[PDB]
Amino acid sequence: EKLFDLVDGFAESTKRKAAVWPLQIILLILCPEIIQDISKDENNMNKKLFLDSLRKALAGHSRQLTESAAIACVKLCKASTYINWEDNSVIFLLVQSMVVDLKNLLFNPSKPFSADVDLMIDCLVSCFRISPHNNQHFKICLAQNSPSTFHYVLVNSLHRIITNSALDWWPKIDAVYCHSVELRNMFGETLHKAVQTDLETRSYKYLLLSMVKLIHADPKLLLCNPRKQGPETQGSTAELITGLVQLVPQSHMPEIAQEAMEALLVLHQLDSIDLWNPDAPVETFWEISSQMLFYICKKLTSHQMLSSTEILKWLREILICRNKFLLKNKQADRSLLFYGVGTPPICRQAQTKLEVALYMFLWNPDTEAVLVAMSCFRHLCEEADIRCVSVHNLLPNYN
């Protein structure tokens, strides 16, 4: 109360009041009983006046005052998230009294935003935390007419929901799969336009990096693909993996290439593998892995990999995980057997591309690729051993 009085001492003009408002709201929240009483004293007159100012500016009836009030009310929502969900204490009610205005301000497509990304994400995360069922703003964000900034903000919201968040009354990553189909509809709608004016391209590239980091955070967000049975598979988990693979050769944007490569490694974990095909995960796994191995090998033999070192490193990791999953399957079910061990089997052709590209690497005029192309030999011997008795019946030169 004393700090509030001192701050209200500095209510000089629109600028001073706007600056104070962010602290004034916080100080008001620091006093619960006072906030309760203001709704119903002369000692409480200035605080009731301040709330008015805020709401007034918020109602859009100057621009600076409105922006400061919106920022303060976003802070209100964030604090109310830290406020007890079970014990609302009309703090949630006080927030909801202005939440409508905030939503009609930030989440209005026609109305311009204010910077916008940070506040928008904060508001969306807070709204989800308090109200997970009331996903109206999110549903608005899944709209073609909605701006790419809307999409970027929504991606950031989902990510930070999946990213660091106190295990409080805060909801979890669940209650967001209702829009998973549309979620993968959007990265398809992007269709990687850069490879597929400048402001739009830059926005698309940043949005692409954001979705990639999202997939880093959670695979399950997009992997809900029950559509994949036949040709729909090429528009499914397979399409996802394929589109992601096509980023690695891309020299236009290297950071997204590293992110996409790491994301492929992440989704390649057996846990993530099981989340691909409910019917026969082993077969779809092996086929899609062969597809991507094909593409990578053709690109490597094409010899336009200016970052061939990192690519080969990642490919070693992919092979390691492929063999680990093969071991898991074989120990689970010994017989994989008829899908590459007996057009020829896709796995055989993929392994041929593998060995061809591995013999290519020992010829690379670099120096660090040597051990890269030798560890991969070791793992190719390991996978043949796991699949099996003479090991030379598969790779005669195993020695």
In angstroms, what is the resolution?
Answer: 3.6
Q: Are 282 and 329 within 8 A, CB to CB?
A: yes
Structure tokens, 315: 């490919």
DSSP per-residue string spanning 318-342: HHHHHHHHHHHHHHH-----TTT--
Neighbours of 244 (CB within 10 A): 21
Cα–Cα distance for residue pair 84/82, rounded to 1 Å: 6
Could you please report the per-residue DSSP string of 349-368? HHHHHHHHHHHHHTT-SSST
Query: What is the distance between the alpha carbons of residues 342 and 336, in angstroms, rounded to a whole number?
Result: 8
Residue of 342, 346, 350 lying closest to 319 (CA atoms): 350
Q: Tokens for 383? A: 């996978």
Alpha helices for the chain (secondary structure H):
2-9, 14-29, 32-39, 45-58, 63-82, 91-106, 116-130, 136-141, 148-162, 180-190, 198-217, 237-245, 254-267, 270-273, 281-302, 308-332, 346-361, 369-387
Q: Report the alpha-carbon distance of residue 272 to residue 266 in Å, rounded.
A: 8
Tell which residue, 133, 59, 130, has the closest CA to residue 98: 59
Cβ neighbours for 249, distance < 8 A, ≥ 6 positions apart: 295, 299, 304, 305
**What residues contact 17, with CB distance under 8 A and at least 6 apart?**
11, 53, 65
Tell me how crowded residue 371 is: count the other CB atoms within 10 A of its CB. Answer: 11
Phi/psi at 163 (5° precision): -85, -165
- φ/ψ region of 13 (left if φ > 0, alpha if ψ in -120 to 50, else beta) reads beta
Distances (CA, A) of 150 to 60, 76, 163, 330, 375: 21, 22, 19, 46, 45
Cα–Cα distance measured from residue 197 to residue 207, given in angstroms and rounded to the nearest whole number:
15
DSSP 253: -
- What angle, 0 to 180 degrees and rounded to 10, lies between the N-to-C axes of helices 346-361 and 308-332? 140
Q: Which residue has the tokens 């974990």?
A: 269
Structure tokens at 164: 């660091």
For residues 1 and 31, is the Cβ–Cβ distance under 8 A? yes
For residues 236 and 118, give the distance between their C-alpha atoms in angstroms, rounded to a whole number. Answer: 32
Angle between helices 91-106 and 63-82 (to 10 degrees): 140
